[PDB]
Amino acid sequence: RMYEAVTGGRGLGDLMRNAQLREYLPDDLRTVYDSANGGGYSGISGSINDILRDERL
Amino acid sequence: RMYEAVTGGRGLGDLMRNAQLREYLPDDLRTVYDSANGGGYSGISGSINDILRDERLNGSVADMRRSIEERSRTAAATDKAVGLRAYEGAQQRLAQIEGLMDEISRTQDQKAIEELQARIAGEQAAIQNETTKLQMIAQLRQAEQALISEQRRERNMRILSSGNQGMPTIQ
Amino acid sequence: ELQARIAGEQAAIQNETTKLQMIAQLRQAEQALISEQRRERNMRILSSGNQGMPTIQ
Amino acid sequence: NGSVADMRRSIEERSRTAAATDKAVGLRAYEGAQQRLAQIEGLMDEISRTQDQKAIE
């Protein structure tokens, strides 16, 4: 029983793996400042357009 | 069998060592700013030359004016939006950390808690990587602000330049 | 278990460091936004499209 | 030192080079960090399947 307890893969280490959070920070910083239209990612674009339109005094 | 499973070098620990990431960052900080022509690397020098070429925009003065104004506006807005999304990401990472802990409360076997400790170490590695990415984004932001100011200087030196020769007409 | 809990604690502290870096970045962005709004205001008050002139009486 | 025009051209070129080098090093380091994250994912996905306590340690 002790031997089977210590030595054997038992599932853990695969917790919250498939949940991806790398998708939130920018993927690549070559079109990051042109992302207002295309290149980069689209949620960034939506936020940029929202702030740019709303800050219009 | 138990002694064999506890004692004896068994390889794992040199996993994925062949790929080296040293060359991504400079070797020494003496020629990094001389790197326009030499010192650094050839690809990074190509990127420097290319970005200098693309920044040196042309056209009539009105086109450069509108381009610079829009560039500044969108730069500020992009900075704010990146901050927003990255904060949502940090909160999600905190949620994962709390989940990992309330999983740590319920591990029964020694190798289970060992694998979980290793997973937490990997989570710390991911968080360190996120911090490095934040630093690089901030540095890029400062560089691009400097570039916008340089474009402004280019325009107001082009207008006032001594090499002009035109003069309006009288009639 | 205590060693792994301390590891989790370090993870939380690193998360706090990330959030502080990010708040500083947002502060700089907000200052730049305020400067841009000032510039837009001084453009609107100096715009060449202002063809109006006060009357004489 | 030298001619003042030499000073002017040297300063202008040095400023442009400084800005461009800053941006380029930033980008290069960013894809480096992406490589690092891929390495981390690989390490964890391979650590889920160890067999002996010495291997996991």
mmCIF file of N, CA and C in Angstrom, chain B residues 79-159:
data_model
loop_
_atom_site.group_PDB
_atom_site.id
_atom_site.type_symbol
_atom_site.label_atom_id
_atom_site.label_comp_id
_atom_site.label_asym_id
_atom_site.label_seq_id
_atom_site.Cartn_x
_atom_site.Cartn_y
_atom_site.Cartn_z
ATOM 1 N N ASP B 79 -3.247 52.292 -25.119
ATOM 2 C CA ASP B 79 -2.630 52.066 -23.816
ATOM 3 C C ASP B 79 -3.690 51.799 -22.758
ATOM 4 N N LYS B 80 -4.723 52.644 -22.717
ATOM 5 C CA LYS B 80 -5.768 52.455 -21.715
ATOM 6 C C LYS B 80 -6.490 51.121 -21.901
ATOM 7 N N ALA B 81 -6.804 50.760 -23.149
ATOM 8 C CA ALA B 81 -7.533 49.519 -23.397
ATOM 9 C C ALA B 81 -6.704 48.298 -23.025
ATOM 10 N N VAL B 82 -5.406 48.327 -23.337
ATOM 11 C CA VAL B 82 -4.524 47.232 -22.951
ATOM 12 C C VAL B 82 -4.495 47.095 -21.439
ATOM 13 N N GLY B 83 -4.407 48.223 -20.728
ATOM 14 C CA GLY B 83 -4.480 48.163 -19.277
ATOM 15 C C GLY B 83 -5.758 47.506 -18.788
ATOM 16 N N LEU B 84 -6.890 47.879 -19.387
ATOM 17 C CA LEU B 84 -8.175 47.328 -18.967
ATOM 18 C C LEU B 84 -8.205 45.810 -19.124
ATOM 19 N N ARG B 85 -7.891 45.344 -20.334
ATOM 20 C CA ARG B 85 -7.981 43.917 -20.616
ATOM 21 C C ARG B 85 -6.998 43.137 -19.755
ATOM 22 N N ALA B 86 -5.786 43.665 -19.593
ATOM 23 C CA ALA B 86 -4.804 42.988 -18.768
ATOM 24 C C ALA B 86 -5.224 42.936 -17.305
ATOM 25 N N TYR B 87 -5.974 43.926 -16.817
ATOM 26 C CA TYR B 87 -6.447 43.828 -15.442
ATOM 27 C C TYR B 87 -7.506 42.748 -15.294
ATOM 28 N N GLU B 88 -8.406 42.643 -16.273
ATOM 29 C CA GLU B 88 -9.346 41.525 -16.243
ATOM 30 C C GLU B 88 -8.594 40.199 -16.229
ATOM 31 N N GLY B 89 -7.510 40.118 -17.000
ATOM 32 C CA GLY B 89 -6.694 38.912 -16.994
ATOM 33 C C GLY B 89 -6.067 38.623 -15.644
ATOM 34 N N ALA B 90 -5.547 39.656 -14.984
ATOM 35 C CA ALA B 90 -4.950 39.459 -13.668
ATOM 36 C C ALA B 90 -5.980 38.952 -12.671
ATOM 37 N N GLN B 91 -7.199 39.487 -12.728
ATOM 38 C CA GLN B 91 -8.242 38.996 -11.832
ATOM 39 C C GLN B 91 -8.567 37.532 -12.110
ATOM 40 N N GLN B 92 -8.603 37.144 -13.386
ATOM 41 C CA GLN B 92 -8.811 35.732 -13.701
ATOM 42 C C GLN B 92 -7.682 34.867 -13.146
ATOM 43 N N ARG B 93 -6.444 35.348 -13.240
ATOM 44 C CA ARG B 93 -5.323 34.591 -12.690
ATOM 45 C C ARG B 93 -5.469 34.425 -11.183
ATOM 46 N N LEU B 94 -5.944 35.467 -10.501
ATOM 47 C CA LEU B 94 -6.191 35.352 -9.067
ATOM 48 C C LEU B 94 -7.252 34.299 -8.779
ATOM 49 N N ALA B 95 -8.291 34.243 -9.615
ATOM 50 C CA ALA B 95 -9.300 33.203 -9.446
ATOM 51 C C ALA B 95 -8.683 31.814 -9.577
ATOM 52 N N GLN B 96 -7.795 31.630 -10.558
ATOM 53 C CA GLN B 96 -7.130 30.335 -10.698
ATOM 54 C C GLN B 96 -6.269 30.013 -9.483
ATOM 55 N N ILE B 97 -5.584 31.015 -8.930
ATOM 56 C CA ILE B 97 -4.747 30.774 -7.756
ATOM 57 C C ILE B 97 -5.598 30.302 -6.583
ATOM 58 N N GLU B 98 -6.721 30.984 -6.344
ATOM 59 C CA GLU B 98 -7.593 30.589 -5.241
ATOM 60 C C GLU B 98 -8.141 29.185 -5.452
ATOM 61 N N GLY B 99 -8.493 28.849 -6.695
ATOM 62 C CA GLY B 99 -8.927 27.491 -6.978
ATOM 63 C C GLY B 99 -7.840 26.466 -6.718
ATOM 64 N N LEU B 100 -6.605 26.780 -7.110
ATOM 65 C CA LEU B 100 -5.500 25.867 -6.843
ATOM 66 C C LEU B 100 -5.340 25.627 -5.348
ATOM 67 N N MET B 101 -5.489 26.678 -4.543
ATOM 68 C CA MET B 101 -5.335 26.503 -3.101
ATOM 69 C C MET B 101 -6.464 25.650 -2.521
ATOM 70 N N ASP B 102 -7.714 25.995 -2.832
ATOM 71 C CA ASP B 102 -8.769 25.176 -2.249
ATOM 72 C C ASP B 102 -8.757 23.760 -2.816
ATOM 73 N N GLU B 103 -8.002 23.518 -3.893
ATOM 74 C CA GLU B 103 -7.631 22.150 -4.239
ATOM 75 C C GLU B 103 -6.532 21.608 -3.333
ATOM 76 N N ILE B 104 -5.584 22.453 -2.917
ATOM 77 C CA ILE B 104 -4.497 21.978 -2.063
ATOM 78 C C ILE B 104 -5.033 21.458 -0.749
ATOM 79 N N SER B 105 -6.201 21.938 -0.330
ATOM 80 C CA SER B 105 -6.739 21.470 0.944
ATOM 81 C C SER B 105 -7.087 19.982 0.950
ATOM 82 N N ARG B 106 -7.244 19.348 -0.211
ATOM 83 C CA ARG B 106 -7.868 18.029 -0.311
ATOM 84 C C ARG B 106 -7.018 17.045 -1.117
ATOM 85 N N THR B 107 -5.720 16.979 -0.840
ATOM 86 C CA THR B 107 -4.828 16.029 -1.495
ATOM 87 C C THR B 107 -4.379 14.984 -0.485
ATOM 88 N N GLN B 108 -4.617 13.710 -0.801
ATOM 89 C CA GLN B 108 -4.462 12.638 0.172
ATOM 90 C C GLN B 108 -3.127 11.912 0.118
ATOM 91 N N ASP B 109 -2.525 11.754 -1.055
ATOM 92 C CA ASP B 109 -1.298 10.982 -1.189
ATOM 93 C C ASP B 109 -0.112 11.914 -1.378
ATOM 94 N N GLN B 110 1.074 11.428 -1.003
ATOM 95 C CA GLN B 110 2.261 12.273 -1.058
ATOM 96 C C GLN B 110 2.575 12.710 -2.482
ATOM 97 N N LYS B 111 2.478 11.797 -3.448
ATOM 98 C CA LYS B 111 2.780 12.202 -4.813
ATOM 99 C C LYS B 111 1.712 13.137 -5.362
ATOM 100 N N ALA B 112 0.476 13.031 -4.875
ATOM 101 C CA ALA B 112 -0.554 13.977 -5.286
ATOM 102 C C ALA B 112 -0.181 15.398 -4.883
ATOM 103 N N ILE B 113 0.146 15.601 -3.606
ATOM 104 C CA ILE B 113 0.511 16.937 -3.152
ATOM 105 C C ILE B 113 1.834 17.370 -3.773
ATOM 106 N N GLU B 114 2.712 16.423 -4.104
ATOM 107 C CA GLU B 114 3.950 16.795 -4.783
ATOM 108 C C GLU B 114 3.673 17.328 -6.185
ATOM 109 N N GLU B 115 2.831 16.628 -6.947
ATOM 110 C CA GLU B 115 2.455 17.111 -8.269
ATOM 111 C C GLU B 115 1.756 18.456 -8.172
ATOM 112 N N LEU B 116 0.939 18.648 -7.136
ATOM 113 C CA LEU B 116 0.252 19.924 -6.983
ATOM 114 C C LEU B 116 1.223 21.050 -6.648
ATOM 115 N N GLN B 117 2.224 20.770 -5.814
ATOM 116 C CA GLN B 117 3.249 21.770 -5.531
ATOM 117 C C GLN B 117 3.999 22.146 -6.799
ATOM 118 N N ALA B 118 4.308 21.151 -7.629
ATOM 119 C CA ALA B 118 4.950 21.436 -8.907
ATOM 120 C C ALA B 118 4.055 22.289 -9.800
ATOM 121 N N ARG B 119 2.752 22.000 -9.812
ATOM 122 C CA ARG B 119 1.823 22.804 -10.598
ATOM 123 C C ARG B 119 1.781 24.244 -10.103
ATOM 124 N N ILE B 120 1.794 24.442 -8.785
ATOM 125 C CA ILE B 120 1.803 25.802 -8.254
ATOM 126 C C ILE B 120 3.084 26.518 -8.661
ATOM 127 N N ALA B 121 4.210 25.804 -8.654
ATOM 128 C CA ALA B 121 5.448 26.410 -9.130
ATOM 129 C C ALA B 121 5.322 26.826 -10.591
ATOM 130 N N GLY B 122 4.669 25.997 -11.401
ATOM 131 C CA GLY B 122 4.435 26.373 -12.786
ATOM 132 C C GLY B 122 3.541 27.590 -12.916
ATOM 133 N N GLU B 123 2.551 27.705 -12.035
ATOM 134 C CA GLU B 123 1.712 28.896 -12.031
ATOM 135 C C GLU B 123 2.533 30.137 -11.715
ATOM 136 N N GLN B 124 3.456 30.026 -10.756
ATOM 137 C CA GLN B 124 4.342 31.149 -10.463
ATOM 138 C C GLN B 124 5.197 31.493 -11.672
ATOM 139 N N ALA B 125 5.650 30.478 -12.405
ATOM 140 C CA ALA B 125 6.400 30.743 -13.626
ATOM 141 C C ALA B 125 5.557 31.529 -14.624
ATOM 142 N N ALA B 126 4.293 31.141 -14.784
ATOM 143 C CA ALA B 126 3.414 31.865 -15.698
ATOM 144 C C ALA B 126 3.211 33.306 -15.245
ATOM 145 N N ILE B 127 3.075 33.525 -13.936
ATOM 146 C CA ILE B 127 2.874 34.884 -13.441
ATOM 147 C C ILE B 127 4.124 35.730 -13.661
ATOM 148 N N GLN B 128 5.306 35.155 -13.421
ATOM 149 C CA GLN B 128 6.544 35.865 -13.727
ATOM 150 C C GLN B 128 6.577 36.264 -15.194
ATOM 151 N N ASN B 129 6.147 35.356 -16.071
ATOM 152 C CA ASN B 129 6.124 35.666 -17.496
ATOM 153 C C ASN B 129 5.163 36.810 -17.796
ATOM 154 N N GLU B 130 4.007 36.824 -17.132
ATOM 155 C CA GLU B 130 3.079 37.936 -17.317
ATOM 156 C C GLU B 130 3.715 39.252 -16.892
ATOM 157 N N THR B 131 4.451 39.247 -15.779
ATOM 158 C CA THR B 131 5.110 40.475 -15.333
ATOM 159 C C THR B 131 6.131 40.955 -16.357
ATOM 160 N N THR B 132 6.909 40.030 -16.920
ATOM 161 C CA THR B 132 7.867 40.422 -17.951
ATOM 162 C C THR B 132 7.157 41.025 -19.159
ATOM 163 N N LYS B 133 6.034 40.429 -19.571
ATOM 164 C CA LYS B 133 5.291 40.976 -20.702
ATOM 165 C C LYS B 133 4.777 42.377 -20.401
ATOM 166 N N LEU B 134 4.320 42.614 -19.171
ATOM 167 C CA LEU B 134 3.903 43.963 -18.802
ATOM 168 C C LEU B 134 5.058 44.950 -18.921
ATOM 169 N N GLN B 135 6.247 44.562 -18.454
ATOM 170 C CA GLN B 135 7.392 45.462 -18.576
ATOM 171 C C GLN B 135 7.702 45.777 -20.033
ATOM 172 N N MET B 136 7.676 44.759 -20.895
ATOM 173 C CA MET B 136 7.978 44.995 -22.305
ATOM 174 C C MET B 136 6.937 45.894 -22.960
ATOM 175 N N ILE B 137 5.661 45.715 -22.614
ATOM 176 C CA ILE B 137 4.633 46.591 -23.166
ATOM 177 C C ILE B 137 4.867 48.030 -22.725
ATOM 178 N N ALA B 138 5.212 48.234 -21.451
ATOM 179 C CA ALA B 138 5.461 49.595 -20.977
ATOM 180 C C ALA B 138 6.646 50.225 -21.702
ATOM 181 N N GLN B 139 7.721 49.457 -21.884
ATOM 182 C CA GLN B 139 8.883 49.979 -22.593
ATOM 183 C C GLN B 139 8.534 50.334 -24.033
ATOM 184 N N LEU B 140 7.748 49.483 -24.698
ATOM 185 C CA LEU B 140 7.323 49.792 -26.059
ATOM 186 C C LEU B 140 6.479 51.057 -26.090
ATOM 187 N N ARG B 141 5.628 51.250 -25.083
ATOM 188 C CA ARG B 141 4.811 52.459 -25.037
ATOM 189 C C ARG B 141 5.684 53.701 -24.948
ATOM 190 N N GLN B 142 6.695 53.667 -24.079
ATOM 191 C CA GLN B 142 7.585 54.820 -23.974
ATOM 192 C C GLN B 142 8.314 55.068 -25.290
ATOM 193 N N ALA B 143 8.785 53.996 -25.933
ATOM 194 C CA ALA B 143 9.481 54.155 -27.206
ATOM 195 C C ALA B 143 8.571 54.766 -28.263
ATOM 196 N N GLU B 144 7.315 54.324 -28.320
ATOM 197 C CA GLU B 144 6.405 54.836 -29.337
ATOM 198 C C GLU B 144 5.999 56.276 -29.057
ATOM 199 N N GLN B 145 5.876 56.656 -27.785
ATOM 200 C CA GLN B 145 5.654 58.064 -27.474
ATOM 201 C C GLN B 145 6.826 58.911 -27.952
ATOM 202 N N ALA B 146 8.050 58.427 -27.726
ATOM 203 C CA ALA B 146 9.218 59.134 -28.240
ATOM 204 C C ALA B 146 9.172 59.233 -29.760
ATOM 205 N N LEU B 147 8.717 58.171 -30.425
ATOM 206 C CA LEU B 147 8.631 58.192 -31.883
ATOM 207 C C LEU B 147 7.615 59.219 -32.372
ATOM 208 N N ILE B 148 6.469 59.319 -31.699
ATOM 209 C CA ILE B 148 5.486 60.333 -32.077
ATOM 210 C C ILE B 148 6.076 61.726 -31.924
ATOM 211 N N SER B 149 6.756 61.977 -30.802
ATOM 212 C CA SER B 149 7.377 63.285 -30.618
ATOM 213 C C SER B 149 8.423 63.549 -31.694
ATOM 214 N N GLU B 150 9.143 62.507 -32.114
ATOM 215 C CA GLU B 150 10.134 62.678 -33.168
ATOM 216 C C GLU B 150 9.469 63.017 -34.497
ATOM 217 N N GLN B 151 8.318 62.407 -34.783
ATOM 218 C CA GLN B 151 7.588 62.752 -36.001
ATOM 219 C C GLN B 151 7.119 64.201 -35.964
ATOM 220 N N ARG B 152 6.664 64.654 -34.795
ATOM 221 C CA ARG B 152 6.303 66.059 -34.635
ATOM 222 C C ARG B 152 7.494 66.969 -34.914
ATOM 223 N N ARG B 153 8.666 66.606 -34.388
ATOM 224 C CA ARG B 153 9.872 67.381 -34.657
ATOM 225 C C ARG B 153 10.219 67.360 -36.138
ATOM 226 N N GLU B 154 10.035 66.214 -36.788
ATOM 227 C CA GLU B 154 10.318 66.131 -38.215
ATOM 228 C C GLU B 154 9.440 67.093 -38.999
ATOM 229 N N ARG B 155 8.151 67.163 -38.662
ATOM 230 C CA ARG B 155 7.275 68.076 -39.391
ATOM 231 C C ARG B 155 7.642 69.533 -39.127
ATOM 232 N N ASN B 156 7.809 69.919 -37.853
ATOM 233 C CA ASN B 156 8.049 71.342 -37.611
ATOM 234 C C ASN B 156 9.462 71.765 -37.980
ATOM 235 N N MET B 157 10.352 70.819 -38.273
ATOM 236 C CA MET B 157 11.616 71.157 -38.907
ATOM 237 C C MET B 157 11.498 71.198 -40.422
ATOM 238 N N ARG B 158 10.618 70.381 -41.004
ATOM 239 C CA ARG B 158 10.417 70.428 -42.445
ATOM 240 C C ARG B 158 9.767 71.736 -42.871
ATOM 241 N N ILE B 159 8.811 72.237 -42.086
ATOM 242 C CA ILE B 159 8.170 73.502 -42.442
ATOM 243 C C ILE B 159 9.172 74.648 -42.398
#
